[PDB]
Design an enzyme around this catalytic site. Structure first.
Site, PDB file in Angstrom:
ATOM      1  N   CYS A   1       6.977 -16.855 -16.989  1.00 16.64           N
ATOM      2  CA  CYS A   1       6.007 -16.504 -17.802  1.00 16.64           C
ATOM      3  C   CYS A   1       5.975 -16.932 -19.509  1.00 16.64           C
ATOM      4  O   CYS A   1       6.929 -17.041 -19.877  1.00 16.64           O
ATOM      5  CB  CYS A   1       5.562 -15.240 -18.034  1.00 16.64           C
ATOM      6  SG  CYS A   1       6.286 -13.994 -19.226  1.00 16.64           S
TER       7      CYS A   1
ATOM      8  N   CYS B   1       8.140 -14.975 -22.169  1.00 15.50           N
ATOM      9  CA  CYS B   1       9.566 -15.306 -22.056  1.00 15.50           C
ATOM     10  C   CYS B   1       9.844 -16.547 -22.618  1.00 15.50           C
ATOM     11  O   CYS B   1      11.179 -16.885 -22.997  1.00 15.50           O
ATOM     12  CB  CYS B   1      10.113 -15.308 -20.605  1.00 15.50           C
ATOM     13  SG  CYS B   1      10.245 -13.437 -20.048  1.00 15.50           S
TER      14      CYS B   1
ATOM     15  N   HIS C   1       4.336  -9.991 -18.746  1.00 16.00           N
ATOM     16  CA  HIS C   1       5.495 -10.476 -18.150  1.00 16.00           C
ATOM     17  C   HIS C   1       5.667  -9.811 -17.063  1.00 16.00           C
ATOM     18  O   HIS C   1       6.243 -10.349 -15.893  1.00 16.00           O
ATOM     19  CB  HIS C   1       6.783 -10.064 -19.147  1.00 16.00           C
ATOM     20  CG  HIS C   1       7.784  -9.829 -18.288  1.00 16.00           C
ATOM     21  ND1 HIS C   1       8.735 -11.108 -17.715  1.00 16.00           N
ATOM     22  CD2 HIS C   1       8.605  -8.884 -17.786  1.00 16.00           C
ATOM     23  CE1 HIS C   1       9.817 -10.677 -17.314  1.00 16.00           C
ATOM     24  NE2 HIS C   1       9.565  -9.477 -16.851  1.00 16.00           N
TER      25      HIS C   1
ATOM     26  N   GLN D   1      -4.124   5.807   9.581  1.00 22.92           N
ATOM     27  CA  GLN D   1      -3.483   7.197   8.989  1.00 22.92           C
ATOM     28  C   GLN D   1      -2.678   7.795   9.965  1.00 22.92           C
ATOM     29  O   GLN D   1      -2.334   6.983  10.955  1.00 22.92           O
ATOM     30  CB  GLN D   1      -4.767   8.231   8.391  1.00 22.92           C
ATOM     31  CG  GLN D   1      -5.647   7.698   7.434  1.00 22.92           C
ATOM     32  CD  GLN D   1      -4.981   7.785   6.061  1.00 22.92           C
ATOM     33  OE1 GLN D   1      -3.933   8.749   5.940  1.00 22.92           O
ATOM     34  NE2 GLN D   1      -5.268   6.990   5.211  1.00 22.92           N
TER      35      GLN D   1
ATOM     36  N   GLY E   1      -1.994   6.453   3.627  1.00 29.52           N
ATOM     37  CA  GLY E   1      -1.317   7.493   3.823  1.00 29.52           C
ATOM     38  C   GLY E   1       0.278   7.347   3.415  1.00 29.52           C
ATOM     39  O   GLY E   1       1.121   8.505   3.422  1.00 29.52           O
TER      40      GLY E   1
ATOM     41  N   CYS F   1      12.457 -15.894 -15.852  1.00 32.44           N
ATOM     42  CA  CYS F   1      11.184 -15.939 -15.752  1.00 32.44           C
ATOM     43  C   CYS F   1      10.276 -17.010 -16.498  1.00 32.44           C
ATOM     44  O   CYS F   1      10.903 -17.287 -17.475  1.00 32.44           O
ATOM     45  CB  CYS F   1      10.617 -14.537 -16.702  1.00 32.44           C
ATOM     46  SG  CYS F   1       8.830 -14.350 -16.391  1.00 32.44           S
TER      47      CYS F   1
ATOM     48  N   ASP G   1     -12.232   6.721   3.537  1.00 32.91           N
ATOM     49  CA  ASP G   1     -11.095   7.597   4.190  1.00 32.91           C
ATOM     50  C   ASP G   1     -10.498   8.727   3.627  1.00 32.91           C
ATOM     51  O   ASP G   1     -11.106   9.210   2.487  1.00 32.91           O
ATOM     52  CB  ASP G   1     -10.024   6.652   4.648  1.00 32.91           C
ATOM     53  CG  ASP G   1      -9.137   6.320   3.367  1.00 32.91           C
ATOM     54  OD1 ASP G   1      -9.681   6.057   2.300  1.00 32.91           O
ATOM     55  OD2 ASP G   1      -7.799   6.230   3.585  1.00 32.91           O
TER      56      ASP G   1
ATOM     57  N   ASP H   1     -11.077  -0.091  -3.619  1.00 33.99           N
ATOM     58  CA  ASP H   1     -10.663   0.716  -2.907  1.00 33.99           C
ATOM     59  C   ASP H   1     -11.861   1.945  -2.375  1.00 33.99           C
ATOM     60  O   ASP H   1     -12.802   1.555  -3.373  1.00 33.99           O
ATOM     61  CB  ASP H   1      -9.554   1.910  -3.663  1.00 33.99           C
ATOM     62  CG  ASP H   1      -8.891   2.730  -2.066  1.00 33.99           C
ATOM     63  OD1 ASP H   1      -7.971   3.456  -2.689  1.00 33.99           O
ATOM     64  OD2 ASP H   1      -9.153   2.451  -1.224  1.00 33.99           O
ATOM     65  N   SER H   2     -12.014   2.520  -1.586  1.00 30.72           N
ATOM     66  CA  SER H   2     -13.083   3.186  -1.333  1.00 30.72           C
ATOM     67  C   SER H   2     -13.434   4.534  -2.089  1.00 30.72           C
ATOM     68  O   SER H   2     -14.632   4.817  -2.401  1.00 30.72           O
ATOM     69  CB  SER H   2     -12.769   3.817   0.201  1.00 30.72           C
ATOM     70  OG  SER H   2     -11.666   4.733   0.338  1.00 30.72           O
ATOM     71  N   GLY H   3     -12.554   4.869  -3.121  1.00 32.06           N
ATOM     72  CA  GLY H   3     -12.921   6.122  -4.000  1.00 32.06           C
ATOM     73  C   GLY H   3     -12.535   7.441  -3.380  1.00 32.06           C
ATOM     74  O   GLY H   3     -12.167   8.496  -4.230  1.00 32.06           O
ATOM     75  N   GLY H   4     -12.102   7.682  -2.262  1.00 30.57           N
ATOM     76  CA  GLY H   4     -11.436   8.617  -1.722  1.00 30.57           C
ATOM     77  C   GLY H   4     -10.390   9.268  -2.268  1.00 30.57           C
ATOM     78  O   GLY H   4     -10.077  10.479  -2.833  1.00 30.57           O
ATOM     79  N   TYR H   5      -9.481   8.403  -2.142  1.00 33.95           N
ATOM     80  CA  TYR H   5      -7.904   8.731  -2.735  1.00 33.95           C
ATOM     81  C   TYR H   5      -7.945   9.373  -3.990  1.00 33.95           C
ATOM     82  O   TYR H   5      -7.509  10.391  -4.354  1.00 33.95           O
ATOM     83  CB  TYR H   5      -7.033   7.326  -2.784  1.00 33.95           C
ATOM     84  CG  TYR H   5      -5.690   7.649  -3.407  1.00 33.95           C
ATOM     85  CD1 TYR H   5      -4.573   8.352  -2.552  1.00 33.95           C
ATOM     86  CD2 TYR H   5      -5.500   7.150  -4.656  1.00 33.95           C
ATOM     87  CE1 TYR H   5      -3.416   8.482  -3.230  1.00 33.95           C
ATOM     88  CE2 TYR H   5      -4.247   7.665  -5.247  1.00 33.95           C
ATOM     89  CZ  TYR H   5      -3.266   8.041  -4.516  1.00 33.95           C
ATOM     90  OH  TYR H   5      -1.949   8.423  -5.075  1.00 33.95           O
TER      91      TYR H   5
ATOM     92  N   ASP I   1      -0.895  -3.724  -3.757  1.00 34.86           N
ATOM     93  CA  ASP I   1      -1.540  -3.318  -4.781  1.00 34.86           C
ATOM     94  C   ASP I   1      -0.464  -2.224  -5.598  1.00 34.86           C
ATOM     95  O   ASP I   1       0.053  -1.369  -4.764  1.00 34.86           O
ATOM     96  CB  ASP I   1      -2.877  -2.944  -4.653  1.00 34.86           C
ATOM     97  CG  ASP I   1      -2.849  -1.586  -4.258  1.00 34.86           C
ATOM     98  OD1 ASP I   1      -3.069  -1.197  -3.159  1.00 34.86           O
ATOM     99  OD2 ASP I   1      -2.885  -0.697  -5.371  1.00 34.86           O
TER     100      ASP I   1
HETATM  101  C1  LIG Z   1      -7.313   2.339  -9.985  1.00 32.44           C
HETATM  102  O1  LIG Z   1      -7.075   1.316  -8.847  1.00 32.44           O
HETATM  103  C2  LIG Z   1      -6.743   1.628  -7.900  1.00 32.44           C
HETATM  104  C3  LIG Z   1      -5.312   2.308  -7.988  1.00 32.44           C
HETATM  105  C4  LIG Z   1      -4.785   2.561  -6.419  1.00 32.44           C
HETATM  106  C5  LIG Z   1      -5.460   2.293  -5.135  1.00 32.44           C
HETATM  107  C6  LIG Z   1      -4.965   2.397  -3.782  1.00 32.44           C
HETATM  108  C7  LIG Z   1      -5.091   4.199  -3.848  1.00 32.44           C
HETATM  109  C8  LIG Z   1      -4.372   4.657  -2.457  1.00 32.44           C
HETATM  110  C9  LIG Z   1      -3.050   4.867  -2.515  1.00 32.44           C
HETATM  111  N1  LIG Z   1      -2.055   4.660  -3.420  1.00 32.44           N
HETATM  112  C10 LIG Z   1      -0.895   5.045  -3.067  1.00 32.44           C
HETATM  113  N2  LIG Z   1      -0.764   5.537  -1.776  1.00 32.44           N
HETATM  114  C11 LIG Z   1      -2.229   5.363  -1.242  1.00 32.44           C
HETATM  115  C12 LIG Z   1      -2.781   5.717  -0.217  1.00 32.44           C
HETATM  116  C13 LIG Z   1      -4.107   5.378   0.090  1.00 32.44           C
HETATM  117  C14 LIG Z   1      -4.841   5.587   1.224  1.00 32.44           C
HETATM  118  O2  LIG Z   1      -4.517   6.159   2.253  1.00 32.44           O
HETATM  119  N3  LIG Z   1      -6.375   5.317   1.154  1.00 32.44           N
HETATM  120  C15 LIG Z   1      -6.886   5.037   0.236  1.00 32.44           C
HETATM  121  N4  LIG Z   1      -8.212   4.826   0.139  1.00 32.44           N
HETATM  122  N5  LIG Z   1      -6.366   4.823  -1.029  1.00 32.44           N
HETATM  123  C16 LIG Z   1      -4.933   4.783  -1.117  1.00 32.44           C
HETATM  124  C17 LIG Z   1      -6.558   1.470  -5.276  1.00 32.44           C
HETATM  125  C18 LIG Z   1      -7.216   1.151  -6.600  1.00 32.44           C
HETATM  126 ZN   LIG Z   2       8.683 -13.219 -18.445  1.00 35.49          ZN
END
Ligand SMILES: COc1ccc(CCc2c3nc[nH]c3cc3c(=O)[nH]c(N)nc23)cc1
Ligand SMILES: [Zn+2]
Ligand SMILES: COc1ccc(CCc2c3nc[nH]c3cc3c(=O)[nH]c(N)nc23)cc1
Ligand SMILES: [Zn+2]
Lengths: 367, 367
Positions: free
Chosen positions: B305, B308, B334, B188, B215, B303, B141, B92-96, B265
């Protein structure tokens, strides 16, 4: 495969190497028994413990009787099935833990009562170990606190020797148990030769499948411990396994084997592993130290374990400092594996008559 | 194998199933990407994560840039080598994370400054992901907080769209990166259709290898989220992967796929696993509940895995209540495996044109 059969394949001085045959499997000696407090060898899957090289693991009766409870485990099919380890399992009697990690206790010739409310005695301890499905059963004893006067030590050793009689009879009272498991007696007497000899004679008199040297690893320091082992081990029947309880530092193990010990158990491997301490042929190292942050080498240049084949000191350094569980897993696997490789080297050098030399080379580099 | 190639093998309504080819491997879609915050998928060895069925894992840029640091990881050979996972990795970009788990922050058109002192921007984020050796790079973002006014949402979406331009150029400025990795744009616009359409058009205008629906998963509830997905996904180019960030509950996943999402994810699998929550086709269950103390059945009757196949609910119940690490390991394995089996069922039912039916049967039993 027999209930219990100990045969010595080779000897070098007081050191011995051989095997203990039991229904659940073969135990190569000298042996190191990884410890698991709550029905688990902390941070390791049973298969992983086994891949490390262990032939048998240690079971924690004290914690197990409190949770999930002995009766419960028995109802679920026994410790082996419960935790997924089909090989031999040795269980301590529970006395040591009570007088240690317990709030308040009540001592009496009958046994002990502890709140941490429970009444543990020779008979109860033996029954608990039976319900757990233990392969090697430890007699219920009293671990004399160090230091101790000759009088207090004799008095204690005398009670243990009486409790050992009760453990023996209690064990023989259960057909299933007496027929499929083994009973080990525990020698006491603090650091007094005359007392160790009396404990030894009384135990031999009763007769056990193996004899443990108890009362050590209670803060006496290696010199003192080795001094006691020098005259204590020889007093035990030579044809039976000798088990030094609670001793595990690599140097202690090598020293103890040079003095006739065949079995070991210790929490250090796992505990140190989670604390960030990793064992190597060049001595322990604390992986959290800044010097390892970019060290691409494995924990140990020679270790054959999976961890050293796959990950770097740097990565593990990261995980531990980050409080990651994987960090705890990798450190523990390597540590346990290291201990097993130590044991293999011990067994091989003894079978080859080069143990004394191995001991020297080991210390020289380790320290 | 190409830098990036997405091909759809089958479709059923808005749902799609196919594969994404990248130099490090093939990703089957719809796909679930296990998350690892500090260069590790909590309590799991990479081989275990893979045995579970994952084709790709999620990397935490935020934590990684702080520790052990992006430059450091690059010097050690890159994230893949560092954690021992040679397959695709999305970061991910790190902004969140900054606007979430950070003390205080400073916003500006240039980027963001946070103490938890650091200055993260489109250009820096892209460079950090490059140093980590990320296969799928997320544009930097701004995740509009929910709820949000049309004005604030448009204003934010507009900045993200500008930051996406910079991410795009920054990414194309690095030969190695532009040549071996892929860049995903993030849509967004909060819950506003006209804004989602504008974000979608701007992103498509710039052009990306994949498009994420950002978002959402910010506390809007499933109904609201699904409502937004109904009109949002279709706006994204149909020939590119659709990634719904942060969405992971099984029912959310099934619902999102019915609406065109190809990638997922979520932290729940791992997090819930350590909290004591296990997923089953009959819904989640908290293994710590007294009802499981003597339950010999596996977490889930179906399951496949390893957990189990080997251990009982009772045993896991014990481990978790005892705070044992193994408990955390088994629950996580699991849970991750369950999610992958869900994805396999999704992909198979879609390839066979019986997805709508699967979705029905799934909910009926799950709830
Ligand atoms: C620790 O490892 C990670 C954990 C979570 C994520 C996803 C984070 C995330 C969002 N999560 C919920 N809604 C989101 C929404 C966003 C979003 O709009 N932009 C970004 N860049 N990220 C979002 C990436 C890596
Ligand atoms: Zn299992
Ligand atoms: C949690 O799992 C376990 C941890 C440790 C042990 C060994 C405990 C122990 C001693 N330890 C050091 N000196 C000891 C000495 C003794 C001793 O003299 N008697 C007994 N019964 N036990 C001792 C058994 C199981
Ligand atoms: Zn190793």
């Amino acid at each position: 495969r027999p209930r219990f059969s100990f045969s010595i394949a080779a000897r070098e001085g007081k050191a011995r190497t051989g095997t203990i045959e039991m229904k659940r499997g073969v135990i190569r000696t000298p042996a190191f028994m990884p410890v698991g407090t709550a029905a688990t060898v902390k941070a390791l899957k049973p298969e992983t413990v086994r891949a490390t090289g262990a032939d048998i693991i240690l079971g924690n009766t004290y914690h197990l009787m409190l949770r999930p409870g002995a009766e419960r485990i028995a109802k679920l099919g026994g410790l082996h099935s419960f935790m997924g380890w089909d090989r031999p399992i040795l269980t301590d009697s529970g006395g040591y833990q009570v007088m240690s990690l317990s709030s308040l206790t009540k001592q009496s010739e009958e046994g002990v009562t502890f709140k941490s409310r429970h009444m543990l005695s020779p008979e109860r301890s033996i029954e608990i170990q039976h319900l757990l499905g233990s392969d090697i059963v430890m007699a219920f004893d009293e671990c004399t606190p160090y230091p101790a006067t000759p009088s207090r030590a004799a008095s204690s050793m005398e009670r243990s020797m009486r409790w050992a009689k009760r453990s023996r009879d209690a064990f023989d009272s259960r057909k299933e148990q007496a027929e499929n498991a083994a009973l080990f007696g525990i020698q006491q007497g603090s650091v007094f030769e005359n007392l160790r000899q009396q404990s030894a004679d009384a135990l031999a008199e009763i007769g056990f499948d193996g004899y443990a040297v108890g009362g050590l690893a209670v803060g006496e320091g290696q010199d003192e411990m080795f001094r006691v082992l020098d005259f204590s081990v020889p007093m035990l029947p030579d044809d039976k396994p000798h088990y030094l309880m609670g001793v595990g530092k690599p140097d202690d193990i090598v020293g103890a084997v040079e003095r006739g010990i065949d079995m070991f158990d210790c929490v250090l491997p796992t505990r140190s592993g989670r604390n960030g301490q990793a064992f190597t042929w060049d001595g322990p190292i604390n992986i959290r130290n800044a010097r390892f942050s970019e060290d691409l080498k494995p924990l140990d240049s020679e270790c054959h374990c999976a961890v050293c084949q796959k990950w770097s000191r740097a990565y593990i350094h990261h995980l531990i400092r980050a409080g990651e569980i994987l960090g705890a897993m990798l450190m523990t696997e390597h540590n346990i594996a290291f201990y097993q490789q130590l044991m293999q080297k011990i067994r091989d050098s003894i079978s080859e008559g080069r143990f004394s030399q191995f001991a020297q080379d080991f210390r020289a580099r380790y320290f």
